[PDB]
């Protein structure tokens, strides 16, 4: 979310009357939220959500298995392939 623990820095900082003005001033420097452009260009986004479920849309602990496919299918072939060569060597 943000650097460090994102959860530790959200409660450290919350709204006061002093603070509210500074939020608007910061926003207005670049202008907007900068979070309306992505919905317009794509006209409804199409993220990486297909590969698995530890992807971009994730709300549970990551498994780290989106950088790599399932090699178990491959292994089924590799195992059998070895048996056949081995047998006549």
């Amino acid at each position: 979310m943000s650097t460090d623990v994102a959860a530790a820095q959200a409660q450290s900082k919350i709204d006061l009357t002093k603070k509210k003005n500074e939020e608007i001033n910061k926003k207005s420097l670049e202008e907007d939220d900068e979070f309306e452009d992505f919905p317009i260009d794509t006209w409804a986004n199409g993220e990486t959500i297909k590969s698995n479920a530890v992807t971009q849309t994730n709300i549970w602990e990551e498994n780290w298995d989106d950088v790599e496919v399932d090699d178990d299918f491959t292994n089924e072939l590799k195992a059998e392939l070895d048996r056949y060569k081995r047998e006549n060597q």
Binding site: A8, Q11, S12, K13, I14
Partner: protein, 54 residues
Amino acid sequence: ILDKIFYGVLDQGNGWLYVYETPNQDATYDSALELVGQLNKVVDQLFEKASVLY
């Protein structure tokens, strides 16, 4: 080796067996992992009390 009744390593590329009885552990270091452990829990408890300030 896996049972750890001599916990050595067998080197198969020369066929030689090294037996290691060496301590790879030290007391200060283990107790230190707990001491630091304690402070991390404490700093979460401190954070609640400072919530009033914010």
